[PDB]
């Protein structure tokens, strides 16, 4: 608890790798949530249903 | 770079488990292409500003 972020050597490299999994997360949820929020208007009984 | 493509034996074994992760992503795309290309056709402001 007292070492996690003074190491900035350490941190670099994990900022850069953990930042590339949240974009990676986030690009995959608006495409999803796209598709999604369409076939709703088209039907709403199916959708709500599942 | 003398060695890759000369040992048969070794060789076969790949081109196997590499040809199956080709086509499983080239099924994937076509799965995903057909979904996005008709969304665009119903509300193409929604699906080009994303």
Same mark, same amino acid.
């Given at each position: 608890?007292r ?5 900035? =050597? ?16 986030? !690009? @995959?949820?608006? =495409?999803?949530l796209?598709?999604?929020? !369409?076939a709703?208007? @088209? ?8």
């Open positions: 608890a070492l996690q972020f003074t190491y900035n =050597h350490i941190q670099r490299p994990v900022n850069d790798m953990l930042g590339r999994v949240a974009i990676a997360w986030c !690009e @995959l949820c608006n =495409h999803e796209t598709l999604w929020n !369409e709703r208007k @088209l039907n709403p009984n199916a959708i709500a249903s599942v």
